[PDB]
Amino acid sequence: ISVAAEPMDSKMIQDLSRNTNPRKLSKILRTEYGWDSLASRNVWSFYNGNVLINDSPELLSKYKEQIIQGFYWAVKEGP
Amino acid sequence: SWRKGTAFGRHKGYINDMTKSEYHQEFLHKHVR
Amino acid sequence: DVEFKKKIYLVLKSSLSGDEAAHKLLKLKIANNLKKSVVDIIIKSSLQESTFSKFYSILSERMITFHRSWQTAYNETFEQNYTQDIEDYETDQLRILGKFWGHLISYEFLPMDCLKIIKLTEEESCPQGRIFIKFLFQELVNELGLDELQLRLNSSKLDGMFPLEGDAEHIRYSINFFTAIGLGLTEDMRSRLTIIQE
Amino acid sequence: SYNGIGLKSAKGSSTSGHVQRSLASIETHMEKREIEVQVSELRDRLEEEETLSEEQIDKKCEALRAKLTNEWQ
Amino acid sequence: PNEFMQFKSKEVEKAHPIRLYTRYLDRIYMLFHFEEDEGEELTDEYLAENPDPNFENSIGYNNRKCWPKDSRMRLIRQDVNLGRAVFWEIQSRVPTSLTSIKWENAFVSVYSKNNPNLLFSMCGFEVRILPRQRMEEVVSNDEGVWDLVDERTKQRTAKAYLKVSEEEIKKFDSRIRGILMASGSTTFTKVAAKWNTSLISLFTYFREAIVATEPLLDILVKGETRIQNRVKLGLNSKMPTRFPPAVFYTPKELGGLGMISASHILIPASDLSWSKQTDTGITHFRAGMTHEDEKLIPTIFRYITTWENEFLDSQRVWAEYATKRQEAIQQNRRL
């Protein structure tokens, strides 16, 4: 469950702080912010301010909402 | 082991009278030293 | 200058802590043309008493930490005291004055560059001056230990009392002086003199 | 008591209450990521230009992946 | 026989937890030094004989309420259980039919990794000992601190901070109250001489411990105001313009009362929401006894040599006397 962390861009965190399916998101991210295709197609969900990126598809989508609720419970109260 | 040299250790309401009460004795031991 | 000297002295005696006397001196708002004289009143009133008290140290430390001009005044009065006025004083007066400046050097409100002026030889040392250097390093040892005092002496240079280049006789004289004091800070001069004798 | 310093009252202490302020105070991982990116790109391309059927895109993607693997030892 | 708290060797000193002992009139003073083994063994003996899972050992723990909250013993549960184990072992060693060693009159203070202060109150001196390694920044402090020189390596290794104990402050307040009360119809010079007697007896006992003490300075200012109003209500007029400071502190030969001043100082004032938490610096000064004149009346504490500055000098002059006596025996001359 080894996960890295990168900073959000300043323009991207500003555009996300005004709280602004997947093909529209992928096209907007790839043609606006300069994203990888593998990073743009593989996203679980957006809590506000902070994104969750993927890098066995049954084992991924089997606990989709469980990973996303754990992500929510993590970013609500940090380390 | 350090306490076995001595001679002592763990190894070895209400009544109606006011002058005879518990509080009055606590008082007089508080205020005569 | 009697009534201003009286006013400074009664500021120093109508106080309780050194903090309070520092407040009462700094409320007087004395310009630069009398600050050296105020520091001299503080010195000459610390030396009245029988033993040295910490009051004058706490005072002088707050005075130094208030403004740069008081720190320059204490620089100039330490230089003035050692180069001029040690001929005046009794050994008791030099106990008070030596522990005063030792408590000011040990908490680094006076620099080590303020001890730079002392060069102790046979001809430049008063005997009162030697007893004063003894009391300085006695207070410095009792405040700072031997190790931190070695590290502070090795922070900057003191060519006078520690002649690293020096002469074959002044090193031996400083060795015998600092062993008559009883420091144990001697082994660098020992290595240098054993180099020089061969 | 201005700034919470002074007295409750001047009355009681029998002082003036004149409070004054004191003047004394990994490489493998990277490779994997790259591969993923490549795959994504391929997928995008497929989407853009004639790949409504899955088998084609999947095939091409697979091939790409294989190539990537070959490249990285 | 040994001198007071001296030992014949280091091996006899470390052979027992009770390192130092002294007894006053009826106050004992036991300094212990436990290892990690013996302290937790005694603590688990206590917790097996007096169990408390509700952790109410901090409730009712007598703690020095004069020091700030970082200064006195913090109620760390390991050290509170250790201290109650200590007092339980000491309470077990004497029958109650000989003396009533109760917890109420007992102050236990545990220097450890969590409480860097060793507290006691001997002879009216609230002393807080704090090492040079357990302070973050070594700060030169007031006249009321003591420099504890290690007699091994000749270095100042701890700072003992002094305050006057609250019992002795209340006793001094009661003494000035008795000076007021016995002066029914008494001359003004005898009221001044009683104030001088009790003031000298206060400041030549508690010499430097009054700088770091706030209630004693408060009661000094109030009490010297009481003595001045004892003089002025003998004249049925207490106007400040009518009575300068020159009518009280003028000595008894010039015709004045010869009162000794201890209340024309500035009382150190600090934030009384913060002062009961940390060692606040002296950030403000409340005016002690303001007169309309700018008379800087000298105070007695500046003319009394403080105790550390007496005791270092005492060791010096008695070393000089023992050396002169050894020489005069070597010179065979009577000194």
UniProtKB/Swiss-Prot annotation, chain A:
It is found in: Nucleus. Coiled coil: none annotated. Present with 300 molecules/cell in log phase SD medium. Belongs to the TRAFAC class translation factor GTPase superfamily. Classic translation factor GTPase family. EF-G/EF-2 subfamily. Belongs to the CWC complex (or CEF1-associated complex), a spliceosome sub-complex reminiscent of a late-stage spliceosome composed of the U2, U5 and U6 snRNAs and at least BUD13, BUD31, BRR2, CDC40, CEF1, CLF1, CUS1, CWC2, CWC15, CWC21, CWC22, CWC23, CWC24, CWC25, CWC27, ECM2, HSH155, IST3, ISY1, LEA1, MSL1, NTC20, PRP8, PRP9, PRP11, PRP19, PRP21, PRP22, PRP45, PRP46, SLU7, SMB1, SMD1, SMD2, SMD3, SMX2, SMX3, SNT309, SNU114, SPP2, SYF1, SYF2, RSE1 and YJU2. Component of the U5 snRNP complex required for pre-mRNA splicing. Binds GTP. This is Pre-mRNA-splicing factor SNU114. It comes from Saccharomyces cerevisiae (strain ATCC 204508 / S288c). The chain holds residues 708 to 807 of 1008 of the full protein.
Swiss-Prot record, chain B:
It is found in: Nucleus. It comes from the Eukaryota. Involved in pre-mRNA splicing. Belongs to the CWC15 family. Belongs to the CWC complex (or CEF1-associated complex), a spliceosome sub-complex reminiscent of a late-stage spliceosome composed of the U2, U5 and U6 snRNAs and at least BUD13, BRR2, CDC40, CEF1, CLF1, CUS1, CWC2, CWC15, CWC21, CWC22, CWC23, CWC24, CWC25, CWC27, ECM2, HSH155, IST3, ISY1, LEA1, MSL1, NTC20, PRP8, PRP9, PRP11, PRP19, PRP21, PRP22, PRP45, PRP46, SLU7, SMB1, SMD1, SMD2, SMD3, SMX2, SMX3, SNT309, SNU114, SPP2, SYF1, SYF2, RSE1 and YJU2. This is Pre-mRNA-splicing factor CWC15. It comes from Saccharomyces cerevisiae (strain ATCC 204508 / S288c) (Baker's yeast). The gene is CWC15.
From Swiss-Prot, chain D:
Present with 556 molecules/cell in log phase SD medium. Residues 27-64 form a coiled coil. Residues 27-71 form the CWF21 domain. Residues 26-59 are annotated as: Interaction with PRP8. Its main location: cytoplasm. It comes from Saccharomyces cerevisiae (strain ATCC 204508 / S288c) (Baker's yeast). Involved in pre-mRNA splicing. May function at or prior to the first catalytic step of splicing at the catalytic center of the spliceosome, together with ISY1. May do so by stabilizing the catalytic center or the position of the RNA substrate. It is found in: Cytoplasm; Nucleus. This is Pre-mRNA-splicing factor CWC21. It comes from the Eukaryota. Associates with the NTC complex (or PRP19-associated complex), composed of at least CEF1, CLF1, ISY1, NTC20, SNT309, SYF1, SYF2, and PRP19. The chain holds residues 2 to 111 of 135 of the full protein. Residues 11-25 have a biased composition (Polar residues). Keywords: Coiled coil, Cytoplasm, mRNA processing, mRNA splicing, Nucleus, Spliceosome. GO terms for biological process: mRNA splicing, via spliceosome. The lineage of its organism: Eukaryota, Fungi, Dikarya, Ascomycota, Saccharomycotina. One of its GO terms (cellular component) is cytoplasm. Belongs to the CWC21 family.
From Swiss-Prot, chain E:
It is found in: Nucleus. Disulfide bonds: none annotated. It comes from the Eukaryota. The MPN (JAB/Mov34) domain has structural similarity with deubiquitinating enzymes, but lacks the residues that would bind the catalytic metal ion. Component of the U4/U6-U5 tri-snRNP complex composed of the U4, U6 and U5 snRNAs and at least PRP3, PRP4, PRP6, PRP8, PRP18, PRP31, PRP38, SNU13, SNU23, SNU66, SNU114, SPP381, SMB1, SMD1, SMD2, SMD3, SMX2, SMX3, LSM2, LSM3, LSM4, LSM5, LSM6, LSM7, LSM8, BRR2 and DIB1. Functions as a scaffold that mediates the ordered assembly of spliceosomal proteins and snRNAs. Required for association of BRR2 with the spliceosomal U5 snRNP, and the subsequent assembly of the U4/U6-U5 tri-snRNP complex. Functions as a scaffold that positions spliceosomal U2, U5 and U6 snRNAs at splice sites on pre-mRNA substrates, so that splicing can occur. Interacts with both the 5' and the 3' splice site, as well as the branch region. Has a role in branch site-3' splice site selection. Associates with the branch site-3' splice 3'-exon region. Also has a role in cell cycle. Present with 468 molecules/cell in log phase SD medium. This is Pre-mRNA-splicing factor 8. The chain holds residues 1141 to 1475 of 2413 of the full protein.
